[PDB]
Amino acid sequence: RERDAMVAKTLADNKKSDEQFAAAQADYDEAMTEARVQASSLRDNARADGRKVIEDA
Amino acid sequence: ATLRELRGRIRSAGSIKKITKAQELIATSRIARAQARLESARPYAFEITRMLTTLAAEAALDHPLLVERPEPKRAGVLVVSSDRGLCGAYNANIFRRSEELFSLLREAGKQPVLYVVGRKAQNYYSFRNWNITESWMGFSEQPTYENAAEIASTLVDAFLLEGVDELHIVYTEFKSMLSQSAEAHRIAPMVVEYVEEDIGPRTLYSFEPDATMLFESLLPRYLTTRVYAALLESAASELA
Amino acid sequence: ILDPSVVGDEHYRVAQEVIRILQRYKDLQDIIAILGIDELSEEDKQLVNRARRIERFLSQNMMAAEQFTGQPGSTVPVKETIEAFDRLCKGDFDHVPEQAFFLIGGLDDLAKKAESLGAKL
Amino acid sequence: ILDPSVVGDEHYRVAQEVIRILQRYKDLQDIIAILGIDELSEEDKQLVNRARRIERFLSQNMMAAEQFTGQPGSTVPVKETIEAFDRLCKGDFDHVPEQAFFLIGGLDDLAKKAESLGAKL
Amino acid sequence: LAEASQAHTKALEDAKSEAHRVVEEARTDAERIAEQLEAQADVEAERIKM
Amino acid sequence: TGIKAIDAMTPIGRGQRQLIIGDRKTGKTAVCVDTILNQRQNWESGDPKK
Amino acid sequence: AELNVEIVAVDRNIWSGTAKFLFTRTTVGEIGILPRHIPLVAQLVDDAMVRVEREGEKDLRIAVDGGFLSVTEEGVSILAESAEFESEIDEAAAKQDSESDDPRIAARGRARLRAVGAI
Amino acid sequence: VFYLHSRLLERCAKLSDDLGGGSLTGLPIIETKANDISAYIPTNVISITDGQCFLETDLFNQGVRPAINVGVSVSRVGGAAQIKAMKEVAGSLRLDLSQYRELEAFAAFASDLDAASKAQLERGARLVELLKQPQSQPMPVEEQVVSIFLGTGGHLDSVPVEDVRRFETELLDHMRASEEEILTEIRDSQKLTEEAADKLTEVIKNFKKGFAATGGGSVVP
Amino acid sequence: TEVIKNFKKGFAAVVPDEHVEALDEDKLAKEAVKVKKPAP
Amino acid sequence: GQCFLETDLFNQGVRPAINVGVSVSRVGGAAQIKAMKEVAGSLRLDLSQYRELEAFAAFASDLDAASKAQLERGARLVELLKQPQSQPMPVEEQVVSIFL
Ligand SMILES: Nc1ncnc2c1ncn2[C@@H]1O[C@H](COP(=O)(O)OP(=O)(O)OP(=O)(O)O)[C@@H](O)[C@H]1O
Ligand SMILES: [Mg+2]
């Protein structure tokens, strides 16, 4: 029974290890696209309120 | 006002010319792909044919799909046409061959029963007040073996039964890329022709469980692979 | 005064999109007349439906034409026009028939006439 | 004056042969451009290579280019031109690379430009 | 499994640091643009004055 | 001229005559006014050769 | 020497090579073909598997659907409405599909399951 | 009347260095009717001038603004009136646009096209989006060189065609704020050296990894 | 309207031959199971 | 106004051969009785739109339900306005016909 448990633990280890491996790049791209959207909302709020500064001056 | 009219006509004819040249080049690419499909589907057909003749060598040739039914009263004709309509006299030639076949059938007391594959056949036959038993659409350009299996199952179930005495197929045979010929084929009941001996002191085949059951289980697969080859030849012919 | 500096960015963007759609439709009309609409792409068929709805929604029942159609006239503010044609170009009414766009006012008239033909939006 | 009564029979025959090959190549150029040279047949591929070789051998090292390259200009007699293009159409130069035909004189210049590229006959 | 478990958090912290760097560069050229734009504003103002 | 299409595809030299030809409301006056406006930096250089 | 295996689907040559042993399951029980063997023709079971065993590699396992078998002097030849290798079967859908009520699709599922080692 | 116009337009000259080296550049404007360039006065002034910029209403409505027909617009002076940078980044432009215009009939059958055909189609679409320009917003020559380098260098193949314009603007904006030395080299040397090309390419890569498209995805290769 | 509708009920509101001759029976191709055993 | 008659519409059987698209009356409903003004309210626009729609859908393979309904109504309205020569109709009978 525990030999069966060993081979099952081996298959589950490899499976969810590949899963976490893919999730690594998943969260990596998630963080980077979050950073990109934050960065582009920034400097565009700046472009907007700067245009407003010029139109009020 | 005729000068603006003529310039507009020139512009429209130029648009049409561009579109039709693009369509011709696309059709060249697609006929290449269709010939690929045809020559890739050939080998299984060859092998099932030789296995079927090996089985028939030592079989009891009494299967309903193999016997000529006395007093033929109806005939089921499957007409293979296209869906898109920018082809030439393709469907026209198909319908001419199907009309010749219908006349051959009426000259033998058989009422033709009409199955169609494609929308152009549906148009031609609903305008002529035919009652179409069952239609199939959407796969006249890239037919899959599942469509052939379904069509041949419907046809053989209509044969073994509301019921027909034989089955024909009117489809376009593709050859040499410069001539595509509409052809009528009689796919059931199959003619038994005893060709040769070929093998006398030949190592006899073992059959599991037996020759007759294998033969009667292989015959419908042969009919449906024939219908598949017909659909492929018709697709290549339509693209040409 | 069809200038982003005069009529605003959204007015100008919607007007330019309407003009582009109608120009593409005028370019496709001859093909559709000769070879049929089924020969086009799916993008082009989508655009053709949108362009027909748009060219019918530019029409209007005017106040001075009650003598010619018996129908009273309509008035549509410029903001309602901008937002309505924005929704048309985006494709929010591609399920409403080609009629119900023809000789009406704003979006409420569009809803009324669409439901008069058995549809919603 | 491209007429057997003026230029002769061999001149006219070689000229018509070259023109036929070039017209067929120009017909195939659209299939080659949109769908690729790989899709062509093998007779068509042979004709395309022969036609490219002919079309490139039509070029010449002009006397007006001597100020820029220093190479003296060529003066190919009409007999030598007829012979060279007859041998091209036959196929005697279907193995020589294309770059050996650009801006040369008669047949000896072709043979020398080829030998200087590791290709003879 | 152990090495993948450590590599996950390694890549996680690396992404965190580099993303913070990138958003910092963004918040830098943002105020750069703000400077340039207010400069253009005042020069346009003085132009209209003249 | 400061216009990418012209400066890249149909360049204009100093001494050339380029025709801006078109039906109407196609942007001819706009092209020429942009060509004029593009010389402002050339003017600010103070160089009579520029 | 070895035998020649040629598995051809209805629309595509699935596989073709040389082999040391070829296990499969006819409607009259299991069977194993060896370099020489009497000519035979036999219909494979609904959810047949075909285990080819090559000399210098691992045993290829193929889920066959709709197949027939023909052993001759040259080598084996298998026909097939659909063939799917071991290296490509998704255990999830294959297992989930096995308990379907539709006979053909359940047979496909059981074949996909046998080919990957389970069941 | 041909004399009336040729006498006027032949005074726009480029004098010798013995006469001072001055110059007068003429921009005549002609309004055709229904695109009838074969009318009398259009024929005359087309025959007189050194090149023609044909602006069209159909192109204007398609969003192509300035609505210049780059197919029939010509300049008989040519690359002799271009700086080396613009002369080399814009040589890879006419053929690309012609190939795009001859392939745009297959815009809906890119599945049936060769890989090179589809690549030419997409590059041509990006290039057509590159030559658009707002009104009353002229660009100095180095910014045009950088924009056409974006277009012809392949650095727009990662950007959605509905974003190219914005991307271009933003990149130039970045280069006007951070890396002014590239524009200064192109402006003072009239050419794009290999070192400047490498610097510009790496700046483009950094900006691309910092750029946010409108479809949501990243524009990194 | 009702007069119209009551009139409408009192209002009194085949395959063409095509004259195509018969195909030659020699042209109707026959799918055959080519038995190689002589027993005609 | 104008009642533009055409040879094409004459040969197609449309008689009178009025081109409904380009024909118009600049007085309009003021030159009609109340019954005909109400029943023939937007007849000219409906028929213009029908001719446009049939020209567009001449080669369509499958139309919607509203497009098909409009084509059928337009064909009926065209067949309804045909009339032989020297066969006048009183205004009440024309009202009844356009109400049909
Ligand atoms: N590059 C451009 N982008 C967007 N809009 C433009 C552009 N160029 C011109 N326009 C618009 O086109 C409109 C008319 O253009 P313009 O007046 O320059 O054409 P024109 O050749 O002078 O025609 P006309 O002389 O008949 O008035 C202007 O309102 C302007 O807003
Ligand atoms: Mg003007």
Side-chain angles (χ1 to χ4, degrees), chain F residues 28-30, chain H residues 29 31:
Chain F
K28 312 184 288 287
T29 308
Chain H
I29 293 176
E31 298 220 330

Short mmCIF file of all heavy atoms in Angstrom, two decimals, chain F residues 28-30, chain H residues 29 31, ligand 2:
data_model
loop_
_atom_site.label_atom_id
_atom_site.label_comp_id
_atom_site.label_asym_id
_atom_site.label_seq_id
_atom_site.Cartn_x
_atom_site.Cartn_y
_atom_site.Cartn_z
N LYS F 28 -4.76 70.13 -49.49
CA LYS F 28 -3.68 70.81 -50.21
C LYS F 28 -3.19 72.03 -49.44
O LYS F 28 -1.98 72.19 -49.21
CB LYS F 28 -4.16 71.20 -51.60
CG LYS F 28 -4.87 70.09 -52.34
CD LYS F 28 -5.23 70.50 -53.75
CE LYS F 28 -6.36 71.50 -53.75
NZ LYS F 28 -7.66 70.87 -53.42
N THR F 29 -4.11 72.90 -49.04
CA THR F 29 -3.75 74.02 -48.19
C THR F 29 -3.08 73.54 -46.91
O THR F 29 -2.15 74.18 -46.42
CB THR F 29 -4.99 74.85 -47.85
OG1 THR F 29 -5.69 75.19 -49.06
CG2 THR F 29 -4.60 76.12 -47.13
N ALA F 30 -3.55 72.42 -46.36
CA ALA F 30 -2.95 71.89 -45.14
C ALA F 30 -1.51 71.46 -45.38
O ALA F 30 -0.63 71.74 -44.57
CB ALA F 30 -3.78 70.72 -44.62
N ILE H 29 -0.67 74.86 -56.51
CA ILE H 29 -1.82 74.06 -56.09
C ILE H 29 -2.84 74.06 -57.22
O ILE H 29 -3.16 75.13 -57.76
CB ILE H 29 -2.43 74.58 -54.78
CG1 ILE H 29 -1.45 74.40 -53.63
CG2 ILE H 29 -3.73 73.88 -54.48
CD1 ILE H 29 -1.92 74.98 -52.34
N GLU H 31 -6.71 72.47 -58.29
CA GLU H 31 -7.94 71.77 -57.95
C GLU H 31 -8.50 71.12 -59.21
O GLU H 31 -9.01 71.81 -60.10
CB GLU H 31 -8.97 72.70 -57.33
CG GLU H 31 -8.52 73.32 -56.04
CD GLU H 31 -9.63 73.40 -55.01
OE1 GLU H 31 -10.81 73.51 -55.41
OE2 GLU H 31 -9.32 73.34 -53.80
MG MG K 2 -7.39 75.30 -50.14
#
